[PDB]
Amino acid sequence: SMENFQKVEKIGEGTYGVVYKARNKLTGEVVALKKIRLDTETEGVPSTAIREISLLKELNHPNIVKLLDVIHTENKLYLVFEFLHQDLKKFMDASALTGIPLPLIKSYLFQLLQGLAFCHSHRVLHRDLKPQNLLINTEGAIKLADFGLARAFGVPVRTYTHEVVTLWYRAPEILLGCKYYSTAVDIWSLGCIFAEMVTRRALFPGDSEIDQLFRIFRTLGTPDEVVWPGVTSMPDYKPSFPKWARQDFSKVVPPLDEDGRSLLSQMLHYDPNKRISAKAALAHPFFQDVTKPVPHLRL
């Protein structure tokens, strides 16, 4: 069945299995192949695979990476995806000197918010947004990838897994150990990524849970009952937290314009209830002049 695919190179390793750049010998299509060894004596097919395949077979959107086929040998399982040219992380490092043109940052954020609204509209939380998981092509698209950590949610939400989201991008409601979290966690991560696209360096590079909180608090101010009702009652909230004043938000990302600042401030709102949804953020004045140009660099 893997009869028609010729391997080119190993791309990387995500949440589970290993990705390869391959091409169909018959159609010429370039694909990515996620390969999962199922030696069996483990615990059968892993829940990460069971989630990624059932969710991705439903999520059909130009800004969600496309699952093309599943090939299911007895002790080996292959997932065939559309292939993209690089990840956002590498692109940012490739733009080390020039920085990214504002129309490309703009476009990228718009597209990312579309893909995410679509996940949220289809009861799916991604739960691991970060530049490593966001893939770009030469034609100007950016797409959400690796739904290994994703899950299907109910309305309203139950308590789900706590060990969640890569740390630099983890929302404060998780860090404070709140029993319920929702779609706002994915927005926080896209908020951090927008900052990162402008500056080319992580907004909150923590080295532990507490250091992460403290880095967030020193930037947006330590939250109180006024800015976030019910903070002081959160399981991992400590009354001994240092109380930092909130920075003039223009200082957080200095090159960002007023409309940019406004958008970023609403993605980074402490209170998950008040934080802007993916749906609403699409209509923000920041995107009034939005186009979809091709990347300014060869990928």
Next chain:
Amino acid sequence: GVNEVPDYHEDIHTYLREMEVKCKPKVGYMKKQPDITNSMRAILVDWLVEVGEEYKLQNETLHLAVNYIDRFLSSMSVLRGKLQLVGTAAMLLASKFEEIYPPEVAEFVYITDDTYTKKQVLRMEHLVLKVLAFDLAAPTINQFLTQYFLHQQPANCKVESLAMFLGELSLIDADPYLKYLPSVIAAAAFHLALYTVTGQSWPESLVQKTGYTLETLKPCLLDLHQTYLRAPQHAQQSIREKYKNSKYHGVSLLNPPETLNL
């Protein structure tokens, strides 16, 4: 706030209404099965209830498992000695989809009381996956019930627990409940529960949401009312037992109304 997903709840409902049709088992399947019966299915579902109770699994997992057993059996004939194996793979799969901490395969072999080997359970999992073609994100009675609960003013825990009780009982009996959709059973269960506890009715706000009225719910609502009244007598009893617990406000002890006054 954001826990009830104000910006997406309508879209999500709309989406679920679409998938519950695509994910519907075929109603006439038991007639076409040579060796298993409605009663043999009852015994199995009742057992899975014990399993869920035994491993403290979510109720959502239970509903998901049964959807899988029902779809698999819509296109696969299975001998009576193997019906439990299908259910065990299904319950294993459901847990992998829905649970933060799912039981391990070794535990699933264990509650089948050494009827089947690990080898079998795993091979069966694989097979259920091929037949369902990995389509495990299925709408359930609870995904709907849970949104309906958002309409009571104010919220009543007796109502909530009773509605889930009645939904769960419907899982046991393929005749008749194999012909109603999750959303309609949820709606019947919600009304019946609400009326039993408060004397109130399926509210105008859910007519707006769902498009269902009492008139379109009546046929299901009439079957559900029967099941409720006959429950203490039903051969299968695990669900009654389960809902005596404080966890669910002991609702299975409540008295069903003698009439629905429809």
